[PDB]
C-alpha cells in the first residue's frame, strides 16, 4: 500500500514533466509571436508522447573515448535523485515525514550536481568538460547563499519540518515577512536548476550542448526529464516556503488545488523569464552571488536572528 503511494507520486510527476515541455514550447512560441506545437494531437497534446517514443527508439551512442561506467551511471543518478526530491513535500501530507526535510532537500540537491560532473568528465570530450567545470563554478557561486537564505527564512518556522510551514503561514504568507529574502531565493533557484539566464552547463550558443553533448536517445531523455522535474520540484518548494495555502484537515484537496496552482504559476514565471533575458557569464554569476547576494544575505541573517528575540516572537518548537 506504500508501494502504491510511491507509484502514485512517481508516475504523475513524469506525466507533468512530459507536458511541461509542451507547455514550455507553446508559451515560448506565443511570446515569440508564433504558435508552437499544434499539429501532433489537438493543440499539440500528443507531442510529448511522440518525443518520448522517438527518443527511446533511437540508437544510444557510447563514445569510443568515454568511461563506460560513469557515462551510464550519471543519467540514472540524475533521474533517481529528481524523483526522490518529491517524497518529503507536504501536499498537504508528505509521503515521507522527516524532522529535517529541508536539510534532506539541501543534501540531495547538493548530490545532484555530480550527474552533470560525472557525465561531463566521462564523456571525454572538450565541450563536455567545459560544461562540467561550469557546473562546478555554478555550485560554488550559489550554495552558501542558498543555505543561509533557507536558514534565515526558517528561523520564523521554528524547525526544519516542511509540514510546519503550513502552520506558520496560516494567516499570512511568509513573502510579506521576507520578500527581500524571497527574491534572492528565487534567483538562487534559477541558478540551482541551470535555467536561463543561468544555463551555463549546457550553454547551447556557446558550448553546442555542454555536459550532455555526447548523450543521445534515452539517456539524453532522462537528463531532460530530471531537469524539468527539478524545475517543478523547486517551484513547489518555493510555493510551500513563501506562499502558504490554507489547510483544512477534513478538506485536504482544497490545499492540494491551491498548492498546485501556485506551483504552476511559479513554473510559468520560470518559462516567462527564459524568454526575456540574455545569458549571464559564469564569472559574472559568481560575482553576482558573492558580492551582492552574500553580504545582503549575511545582514538579513543577523536581522532575522535578532528580530524574533527583539519582539518576543520565537516559534514554538524546540
Amino acid at each position: 500500500m506504500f508501494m502504491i503511494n510511491i507509484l502514485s507520486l512517481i508516475i504523475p510527476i513524469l506525466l507533468a514533466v512530459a507536458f511541461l515541455t509542451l507547455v514550455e514550447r507553446k508559451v515560448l512560441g506565443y511570446m515569440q509571436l508564433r504558435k508552437g506545437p499544434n499539429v501532433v494531437g489537438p493543440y499539440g497534446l500528443l507531442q510529448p508522447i511522440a518525443d518520448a517514443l522517438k527518443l527511446f527508439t533511437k540508437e544510444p551512442l557510447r563514445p569510443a573515448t568515454s568511461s563506460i561506467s560513469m557515462f551510464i551511471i550519471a543519467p540514472i543518478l540524475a533521474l533517481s535523485l529528481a524523483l526522490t526530491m518529491w517524497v518529503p513535500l507536504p501536499m498537504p501530507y508528505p509521503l515521507i515525514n522527516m524532522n529535517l526535510g529541508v536539510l534532506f532537500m539541501l543534501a540531495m540537491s547538493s548530490l545532484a550536481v555530480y550527474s552533470i560532473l560525472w557525465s561531463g568528465w566521462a564523456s571525454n570530450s572538450k565541450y563536455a568538460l567545459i560544461g562540467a567545470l561550469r557546473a562546478v563554478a555554478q555550485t560554488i557561486s550559489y550554495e552558501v547563499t542558498l543555505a543561509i537564505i533557507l536558514l534565515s527564512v526558517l528561523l520564523m518556522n521554528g524547525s526544519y519540518t516542511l509540514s510546519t510551514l503550513i502552520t506558520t503561514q496560516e494567516h499570512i504568507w511568509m513573502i510579506f515577512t521576507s520578500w527581500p529574502l524571497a527574491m534572492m531565493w528565487f534567483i538562487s533557484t534559477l541558478a540551482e536548476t541551470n535555467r536561463a539566464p543561468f544555463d551555463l552547463t549546457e550553454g547551447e550558443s556557446e558550448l553546442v550542448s555542454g555536459f550532455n553533448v555526447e548523450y543521445a536517445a534515452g539517456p539524453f531523455a532522462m537528463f531532460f526529464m530530471a531537469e524539468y522535474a527539478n524545475i517543478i520540484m523547486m517551484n513547489a518548494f518555493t510555493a510551500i516556503l513563501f506562499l502558504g495555502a490554507s489547510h483544512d484537515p477534513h478538506t485536504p484537496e482544497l490545499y492540494t488545488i491551491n498548492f498546485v496552482l501556485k506551483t504552476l504559476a511559479l513554473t510559468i514565471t520560470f518559462l516567462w523569464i527564459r524568454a526575456s533575458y540574455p545569458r549571464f557569464r559564469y564569472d559574472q554569476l559568481m560575482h553576482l552571488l558573492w558580492k551582492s547576494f552574500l553580504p545582503l544575505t549575511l545582514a538579513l541573517c543577523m536581522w532575522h536572528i535578532s528580530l524574533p528575540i527583539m519582539t518576543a516572537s520565537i516559534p514554538p518548537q524546540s
Binding site: 547538493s110 548530490l111 560532473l117 568528465w121 524546540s318
Partner: protein
C-alpha cells in the same frame, strides 16, 4: 543478526574506504569518498543522529565538488587509473577487501580479539537505551547548546576560520 542493516552499511563504508585508499585517479577516489559519506550518514541516522549524518553528508558533497574541480586542473594524468587498470591499484583493492572479509569472518562466527577488544556479533541493536521520554531531540538539544554552553568553542572556531581565510590567501600569493 536482525536484518543486518547496520552491518551491511558498515561493510559498504569499509569498502568505499578501500576504494579511495587504493588511490586510483582522484575522480574515482572522490566517488568512493562520496559513497562512504552517504553510507556513514545512513549509519548515523540508524542511531538517531539525523542532523549529524545529514550535516556530514552535505559537508562532504561540497568538499568533494571542490576536489573534483581541483583534480581536473592539477591531477589529470592523461590515462586516468581505475581499480582494474593497474596491478598495484587492483592489488591494494583486493588486499583491502580480503582483509575486511577475514576480519569479519574472525569476529563473526567466533569471538576473536584483534587489537583492543573482541566481538561476538549480536547485532548493534543490543546496546540501545530503552529510554522513553521527551518532546524534543536530545541530539538537536546538544548541538544547539553550542551557543549557550560552548562560548569558548565558538570563539576559537571562529578565530580559526578567519585565520584560515587569511592563511590560504597568504599561501597562494606566490611572488
Amino acid at each position: 543478526m536482525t536484518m543486518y542493516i547496520a552491518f551491511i552499511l558498515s561493510t559498504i563504508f569499509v569498502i568505499g574506504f578501500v576504494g579511495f585508499s587504493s588511490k586510483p585517479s582522484p575522480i574515482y577516489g572522490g566517488l568512493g569518498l562520496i559513497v562512504s559519506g552517504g553510507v556513514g550518514c545512513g549509519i548515523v541516522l540508524n542511531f538517531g543522529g539525523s542532523f549529524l549524518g545529514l550535516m556530514v553528508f552535505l559537508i562532504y558533497l561540497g568538499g568533494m565538488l571542490v576536489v573534483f574541480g581541483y583534480t581536473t586542473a592539477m591531477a589529470t594524468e592523461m590515462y586516468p587509473e581505475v581499480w582494474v587498470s593497474n596491478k598495484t591499484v587492483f592489488g591494494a583493492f583486493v588486499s583491502g577487501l580480503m582483509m575486511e572479509f577475514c576480519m569479519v569472518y574472525y569476529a563473526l562466527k567466533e569471538e576473536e580479539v584483534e587489537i583492543i577488544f573482541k566481538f561476538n556479533g549480536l547485532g548493534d541493536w543490543v546496546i540501545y537505551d530503552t529510554g522513553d521520554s521527551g518532546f524534543f531531540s536530545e541530539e538537536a538539544m546538544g548541538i544547539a547548546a553550542l551557543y549557550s554552553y560552548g562560548t569558548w568553542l565558538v570563539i576559537v572556531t571562529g578565530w580559526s576560520l578567519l585565520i584560515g581565510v587569511v592563511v590560504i590567501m597568504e599561501i597562494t600569493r606566490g611572488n
